[PDB]
């Protein structure tokens, strides 16, 4: 059918009614084929680094050049501040990838494949047009299925730029079928010895009633640096109706203390994360223009060469059935994929290959670990940056501060950490 028929179709109305009895498990939503995406959530990890030059720019900023790596302020006060600006522009540059790519490729946000446990998605940006970049590697692993959790690392050994993080959600519908989504997890970015802690924002999915879903961001994201500098980014959907969307204001502070007072911002950035934004130092200059720089997608090896744990190969028949809009064959291929994976895990275990906690481990940060649980080393980055920001260290929604209501709920404190050795010693998977 034409998208203009979607909203009043029997399938759509049937799906909307089924939401009334929503069990809280999104996996269950029996979404019609036309609103299904053939991309797994393990691929979404790639959206952290689709502008290789912006990902890597902080590593090129040093005591001896920083005033030459700060396009909107050649008079920036410090290399630390220049780097905070660049990491902020990078983080803004991810949002269009993360929150808009299905709209442009499929014509609307669609319901992604729920990843199997142990599912892997790997690739690299080889950065051939820029020798000084080197290859940047993405590893993405499905570390939990009940509930779904994706962990990931993106690293550039040449420039000592490395990213790790993990993600999970909780969602519920309101009466008009808006879907409120709270993200959980965080991502850490190290630029040589300097670190940055990033928290993803809450969001809501609009347009379900009309069968044309889309994301809009709300609340706040933070970027807290080991330098003490902090960026607080606030999202809003003001001006819908006037055709405005995807707005934000980001303010960078000397430290989290100054951040409790807006008038102390060293810079204020505002605009649209999916279009353009300006910056004003404590008149204005263009900070980022998402239309001027296309996304660059990572290199993924051919399907014929992929290991059967790899997302695209693994989801291949299911994807083909979705593309064909065949309810029958989608139900069949899915049941087949479950049998494949069940048998594959058996073989992995038979060869003594660990498939479960493949490249990431769950660390317990609660002051009551289970006897031999994995626990963080003493100068752990996460603890020190969470403390500078007064971030709760528990499994609260991303961005929860100490003493917020959500920080008060006997909540756990388990966080996923990448183990590089595990990739170096990886038994099967290559790029
Ligand atoms: C009723 C189904 C509706 C058609 C869509 C509901 C649905 O598919 C939800 C689960 C889906 C979306 O609608 C948008 C997805 C988020 C998009 C972007 C990202 C960023 C990434 O770093 C982490 C994953 C996340 C948060 C997606 C999670 C699943 C959502 C909410």
Curated annotation (Swiss-Prot):
State the taxonomy lineage. Eukaryota, Fungi, Dikarya, Ascomycota, Saccharomycotina
Looking at the record, which segments are called ALPS motif?
9-31
Q: Matching SUPFAM superfamilies, A to Z?
A: Oxysterol-binding protein-like
Q: Per the database entry, which stretches of residues form a coiled coil?
A: none
Q: Which residues take part in binding 7beta-hydroxycholesterol?
A: 98, 102
* Function field: Lipid transport protein (LTP) involved in non-vesicular transfer of lipids between membranes. Functions in phosphoinositide-coupled directional transport of various lipids by carrying the lipid molecule in a hydrophobic pocket and transferring it between membranes through the cytosol. Involved in maintenance of intracellular sterol distribution and homeostasis. Involved in lipid countertransport between the Golgi complex and membranes of the endoplasmic reticulum.
Instruction: Name the positions where ergosterol binds.
Output: 98
Identify the coding gene.
Answer: KES1
Query: Outcome of altering residue 334 to A?
Result: Strong reduction in cholesterol transport. Abolishes binding to phosphatidylinositol 4-phosphate
Q: Which residues bind 20-hydroxycholesterol?
A: 98
Query: What name has this protein been given in UniProt?
Result: Oxysterol-binding protein homolog 4
Q: Tell me, which GO biological process terms does this entry list? A: endocytosis; ER to Golgi ceramide transport; exocytosis; maintenance of cell polarity; piecemeal microautophagy of the nucleus; post-Golgi vesicle-mediated transport; sphingolipid metabolic process; sterol transport
Q: Where is this region: OSBP-related domain (ORD)?
A: 18-364
- Where along this sequence does the record place binding of cholesterol? 98
Q: What UniProt keywords are attached to this protein's entry?
A: Cytoplasm, Golgi apparatus, Lipid transport, Lipid-binding, Membrane, Phosphoprotein, Transport
Similarity comment = Belongs to the OSBP family.
Q: Where does 25-hydroxycholesterol bind?
A: 98
Q: Any idea which residues bear Phosphothreonine here? A: 368
Residues annotated with Phosphoserine modification? 387
């Amino acid at each position: 059918m034409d998208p203009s028929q979607y909203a009043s179709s029997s399938s759509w109305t049937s799906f909307l009614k089924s939401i009334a009895s929503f069990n809280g498990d999104l996996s269950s939503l029996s979404a019609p084929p036309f609103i299904l995406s053939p991309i797994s959530l393990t691929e979404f990890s790639q959206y952290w680094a689709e502008h290789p030059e912006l990902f890597l720019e902080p590593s090129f900023i040093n005591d001896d050049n920083y005033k030459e790596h700060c396009l909107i302020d050649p008079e920036v006060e410090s290399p630390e501040l220049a780097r905070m600006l660049a990491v902020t522009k990078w983080f803004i540059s991810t949002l269009k990838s993360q929150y808009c790519s299905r709209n442009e490729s499929l014509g609307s946000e669609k319901k992604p494949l729920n990843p199997f446990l142990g599912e892997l998605f790997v690739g690299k940006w080889e950065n051939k047009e820029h020798p000084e970049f080197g290859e940047t590697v993405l590893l993405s692993e499905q570390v939990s299925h009940h509930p779904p959790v994706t962990a990931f690392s993106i690293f550039n050994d040449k420039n000592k730029v490395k990213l790790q993080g993990y993600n999970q959600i909780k969602a519920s519908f309101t009466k008009s079928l808006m879907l409120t989504v709270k993200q959980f997890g965080h991502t850490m970015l190290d630029i040589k010895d300097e670190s940055y802690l990033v928290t993803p924002p809450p969001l809501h999915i609009e347009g379900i009633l009309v069968a044309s879903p889309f994301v809009e961001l709300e609340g706040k994201s933070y970027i807290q640096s080991s330098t003490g500098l902090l960026c607080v980014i606030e999202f809003s959907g003001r001006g819908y109706f006037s055709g405005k969307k995807n707005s934000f204001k980001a303010r960078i502070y000397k430290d989290s203390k100054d951040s409790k007072d807006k008038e102390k911002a060293l810079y204020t950035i505002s605009g649209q994360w999916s279009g353009s934004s300006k910056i004003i130092k404590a008149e204005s200059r263009l900070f980022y223009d998402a239309a001027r720089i296309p996304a660059e997608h990572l290199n993924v090896k051919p399907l014929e060469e992929q290991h059967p744990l790899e997302s695209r190969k693994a989801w291949y028949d299911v994807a083909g059935a979705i593309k064909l809009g065949d309810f029958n064959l989608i139900a069949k291929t899915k049941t087949e994929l479950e049998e494949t994976q069940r048998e594959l895990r058996k073989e992995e275990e038979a060869k003594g290959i660990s498939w479960q906690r493949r490249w990431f481990k769950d660390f317990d940060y609660s002051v009551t670990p289970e006897e031999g649980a994995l626990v963080p080393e003493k100068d752990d980055t996460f603890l020190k940056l969470a403390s500078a920001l007064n971030l709760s260290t528990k499994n609260a929604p991303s961005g929860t501060l100490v003493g917020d209501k959500e920080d008060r709920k006997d909540l756990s404190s388990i966080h996923w950490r990448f183990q590089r050795e595990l990739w170096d010693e990886e038994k099967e998977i290559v790029l």
